[PDB]
Design a protein around this ligand. Sequence first.
Ligand code: MG
Ligand code: MG
Ligand code: MG
Ligand code: MG
Ligand code: MG
Ligand code: MG
Ligand code: MG
Ligand code: MG
Ligand code: MG
Ligand code: MG
Ligand code: MG
Ligand code: MG
Ligand code: MG
Ligand code: MG
Ligand code: MG
Ligand code: MG
Ligand code: MG
Ligand code: MG
Ligand code: MG
Ligand code: MG
Ligand code: MG
Ligand code: MG
Ligand code: MG
Ligand code: MG
Ligand code: MG
Ligand code: MG
Ligand code: MG
Ligand code: MG
Ligand code: MG
Lengths: 205, 111, 120
Amino acid sequence: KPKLRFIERAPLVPKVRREPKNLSDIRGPSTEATEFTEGNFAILALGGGYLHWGHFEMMRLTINRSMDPKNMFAIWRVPAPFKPITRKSVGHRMGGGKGAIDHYVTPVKAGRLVVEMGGRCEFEEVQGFLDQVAHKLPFAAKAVSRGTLEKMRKDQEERERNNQNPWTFERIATANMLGIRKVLSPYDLTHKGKYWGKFYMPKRV
Amino acid sequence: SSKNLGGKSSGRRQGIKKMEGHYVHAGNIIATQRHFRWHPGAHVGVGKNKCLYALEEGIVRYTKEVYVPHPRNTEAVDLITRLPKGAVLYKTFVHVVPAKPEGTFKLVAML
Amino acid sequence: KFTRSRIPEKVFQASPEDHEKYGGDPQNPHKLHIVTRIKSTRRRPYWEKDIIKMLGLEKAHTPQVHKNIPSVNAKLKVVKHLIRIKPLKLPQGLPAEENMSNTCLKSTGELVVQWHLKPV
RNA sequence: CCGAGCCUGGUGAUAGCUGGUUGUCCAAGAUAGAAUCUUAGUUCAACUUUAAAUUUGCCCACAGAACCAAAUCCCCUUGUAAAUUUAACUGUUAGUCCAAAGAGGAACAGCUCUUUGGACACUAGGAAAAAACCUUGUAGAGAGAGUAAAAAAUUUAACACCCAUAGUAGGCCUAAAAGCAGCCACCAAUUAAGAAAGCGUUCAAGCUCAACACCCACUACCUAAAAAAUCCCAAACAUAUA
RNA sequence: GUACCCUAACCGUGCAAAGGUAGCAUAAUCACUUGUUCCUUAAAUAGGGACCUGUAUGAAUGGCUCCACGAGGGUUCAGCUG
RNA sequence: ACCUCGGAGCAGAACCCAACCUCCGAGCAGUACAUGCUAAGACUUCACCAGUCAAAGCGAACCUCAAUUGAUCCAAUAACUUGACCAACGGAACAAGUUACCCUAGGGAUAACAGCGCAAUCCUAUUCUAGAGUCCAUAUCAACAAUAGGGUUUACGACCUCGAUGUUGGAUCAGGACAUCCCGAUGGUGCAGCCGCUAUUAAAGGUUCGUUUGUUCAACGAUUAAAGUCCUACGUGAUCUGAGUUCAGACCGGAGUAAUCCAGGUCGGUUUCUAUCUACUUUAUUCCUCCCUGUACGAAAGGACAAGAGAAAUAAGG
RNA sequence: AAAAGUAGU
RNA sequence: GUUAAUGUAGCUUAAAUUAUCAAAGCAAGGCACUGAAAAUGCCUAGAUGAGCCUCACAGCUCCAUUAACACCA
RNA sequence: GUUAAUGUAGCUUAAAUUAUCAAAGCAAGGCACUGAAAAUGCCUAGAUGAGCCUCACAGCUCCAUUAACACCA
RNA sequence: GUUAAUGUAGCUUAAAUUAUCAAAGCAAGGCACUGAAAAUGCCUAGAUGAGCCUCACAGCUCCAUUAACACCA
Ligand SMILES: [Mg+2]
Ligand SMILES: [Mg+2]
Ligand SMILES: [Mg+2]
Ligand SMILES: [Mg+2]
Ligand SMILES: [Mg+2]
Ligand SMILES: [Mg+2]
Ligand SMILES: [Mg+2]
Ligand SMILES: [Mg+2]
Ligand SMILES: [Mg+2]
Ligand SMILES: [Mg+2]
Ligand SMILES: [Mg+2]
Ligand SMILES: [Mg+2]
Ligand SMILES: [Mg+2]
Ligand SMILES: [Mg+2]
Ligand SMILES: [Mg+2]
Ligand SMILES: [Mg+2]
Ligand SMILES: [Mg+2]
Ligand SMILES: [Mg+2]
Ligand SMILES: [Mg+2]
Ligand SMILES: [Mg+2]
Ligand SMILES: [Mg+2]
Ligand SMILES: [Mg+2]
Ligand SMILES: [Mg+2]
Ligand SMILES: [Mg+2]
Ligand SMILES: [Mg+2]
Ligand SMILES: [Mg+2]
Ligand SMILES: [Mg+2]
Ligand SMILES: [Mg+2]
Ligand SMILES: [Mg+2]
């Protein structure tokens, strides 16, 4: 069966404990699935963000409505929604605890492949509707191939060699050159100067 | 509402009271803990509440040493007989190297 | 949190291309530093406010000689952006006592030993 | 002026509450918390001041600190001059924002709450005015001098030209499905045109596209909207040398 | 819960000291609410007469009619008047 | 709802660390019976009070646990000892409602109105091509989503004001925005024509009178070219109103033993001001009728624009 | 002492 | 926190040791069936461990249940 | 939105743990037939899930149904 | 202008999935004939469509409608 499955809202063993919202699940490069597993053409996530169940339906509709199940397959790469989100009821004053578990999200970091697609097809073909779905994703995304993606990282290790701007961000943060760690995060020692909050700026080394 | 009560105990101040190389005396509490962290080694006793006191004056040293639990310590000799044969457990220990001798002999009487 | 930084010891080893940008040779390193405060100790943490009061650097743009020994360098590594370091490069000798009454610093950092203001 | 008259006395009632506190000059000086009918307050601790006695105090390097990230602790050297105890006290103990790690809330608030550090309630220059951002702090006269921080940069979407025959009303099931509702195979002529990729048809027909031929040659920059309510808001300027 | 409008004449069962009886009723009577209908109006969240879930009416905490009366509070024909 | 003690997270690696932040627990049970007596040195819940550990010695054998708790004074006891859901848990020996009849001291340290911040809810526009539209995404409508905007609502925060910033509707006078209801011009149409639907541009001009209710609203009647969306301290009370709401009186239903109370209703209920200062005080649209004519269009019912004539209405000025 | 009913010509 | 009284066939009472009866309960006993009233039979651990002898019967051990009081820090 | 109560044979009632007795419903029998009555039977996932020990059983874990409270300008 | 909640053989309820019955009305059953009662069958687009797995069975597309509301203070 070469079709994306019924990924579901609110998993079956539910989360009675209300997890604190940690925002470290969104920052920086991915540590999970950033590289392919038996596919060719995929959606890259060039920004952090959560993924609602209304976001999985837009993916499960417009891929499976416009992919031929004789010639192409598709698998998810993201997990199920597991992180619960609390919503206090409408119009309530501050304080009083934590509200009930309303819905669920899954956190996607930047540089993570979210949907994998392959088969007897080409990338100039499936750009027709992977670019359709990557604009409705709630982060900056772009459709990659196996071969188009690695073209991007060939340039990203070229921009760290080409430039004659004699200071990089890696040089100044690590050495603490202008006393700059008064204004820098510990996490921007180890990300690079590229990520900043949720957002990824690819246009800088 | 806020069904969560009782989260209002203070931190217990359990830690090392004498770091490595400190000149401890006979009876100072070297380290204080619950749920064993540093085991008592040479010339270091242990209390009821697992505090580590020194018994000999000297310098406190911290090492890594082989764990062999007491055979009537049933909670650990079961834990020993599940390892593969090449294994040992290596807890960390607190010693006191003594600094004064036990004494000298003094002439009191050309008698 | 914001806190005291260790700096890697990778950056305090000069490249072979770095010995051409400045005037030093790695064998025979210099004896004393010239340390001059060029930045304020305000809007800086309290540890940098304490280091500056030890190195004699309470006053901006007054140079100071500190030894080129690693116990001084350690204090200088944690305050190296408030200060400007040049080697004290003596052209002539160390001053003798008959000589020592008329010396000048000569920024370009050359503790010249004979300071008479007639021209060449 | 009666939810209990008025006058005098007690009475200078009491007020953790508001207001007010009068010469000149110099000096040190910013708030970890805990109890409390306590959170508009006070007592202790902390921080601060003074007078003393003594000897170390900050900064730190090897080594060292648990199993189930930034860093800190301990710490000789060294740079430095403070620290600890003793004696006497008052006051502050209703805080703001910025950076960073977090928690609550909308991954809202000039929001609330902790931590680390700043700065502010201390003067001055800058960011238009400006508490909190940046530069900078130990004081006076000067019609001297070098500097510090310090003024935003951007303007985008042309496109191939011609030509198209034919085993075919390609087999199935369909009122009918002829390349184009659906299945199956994807064979094939001339040089060259898919058992056909989009419209158009009940279906057929009609349009293109992919093809020979045609040539100079695909010519190929791969980009990214704007709305309030008294009246736009410095004036303006592309060109003489860091 | 029934004959049957899906409503109780009745059946079965519990508690009570007694289970709100007679009247009146969308009221100066929690809400729904501008209940529904006839009249009044060209038009009526007003007013008058009824129907009754008043599920929070109700009998000297007085209930309901009725003659007079009221600088009481609403509705109105007609006249009249800046 | 909580109030004291304990484990765990936030607080990742000495110690510490809030929260009406997330989760678990405790207010004891069990064995001894040396759970005897003393005594160097230390830890410490950020103070104190309390809590902790313990070498040696005298004396005899040869404690588990995480919290598992309560000061002083007084009682009872010959003495050793023993007394609190003193749980508001550092504990007042023993004391509840109510106040719109209220008073005083303060507070913008703290709420209502108004401003401001924010934009979750609201509103709008685009991106995307699902699907409606017999076919056909883009005439019109639009799913899941994305990106911007606005600052009209319900909120939320508590920053200015409690040694007073007067409060809803209405009257009067209006200023402004345009996201246009009418009038004007234009593109598309699933626009035959008439009416329309939608979009660009345009804010000079205009935008009705009544019954009911305090009503903004809304329902309705009659029209109109149309009966705009909003802001302006929910514009405007030193210009007015006082019907409601928001004091003292009073019923009614309910709550409560009562006093009293109610986003429940209903009758009634004082709206002050002589102007110092700023500011200021005389500068054209639209409808309809006739005509085109019963033409253009359509098959017909239906039916135009344009040009032209003339009538009125408002507004402004006499 | 306790007995209630029997469809329409 | 202290006294004082009391436990029974399933429920009420008592007899000075030697333990009496009405309900409940099981039967026939009788009529076309329910209830009394008679009755035989049946069920008294006389609340607890011993006894100083023979104990509802008595000096202790308590298991409890109820009276009369007195406790605040 | 918050508090407190309560989830039972098809129905309602209880029992301080073991779930009774009263309908209804099921077969019999008395009456010509049915009722009423007399002899029997059956019927509760005791609303929701693990068990520290044994739980309608007592702490919860859950969904329905009701009460009283959603105010001050 | 707002949300939540319902949409059924013809009528009603339900089954908290797998679709029950009383009727309107079909004809057997039994009586002289009919009523009543009993035996069945019928007849459920589950209000609307792509199903993601399969669907009253669940999120919606959708066409009506009951309520709560937009009041204030
Ligand atoms: Mg803790
Ligand atoms: Mg604490
Ligand atoms: Mg006084
Ligand atoms: Mg006070
Ligand atoms: Mg000073
Ligand atoms: Mg108080
Ligand atoms: Mg703040
Ligand atoms: Mg053609
Ligand atoms: Mg009423
Ligand atoms: Mg009179
Ligand atoms: Mg201490
Ligand atoms: Mg001992
Ligand atoms: Mg207290
Ligand atoms: Mg207390
Ligand atoms: Mg009154
Ligand atoms: Mg009164
Ligand atoms: Mg007052
Ligand atoms: Mg406000
Ligand atoms: Mg379509
Ligand atoms: Mg304020
Ligand atoms: Mg605040
Ligand atoms: Mg005020
Ligand atoms: Mg004033
Ligand atoms: Mg416009
Ligand atoms: Mg106003
Ligand atoms: Mg005014
Ligand atoms: Mg009057
Ligand atoms: Mg007036
Ligand atoms: Mg003035």
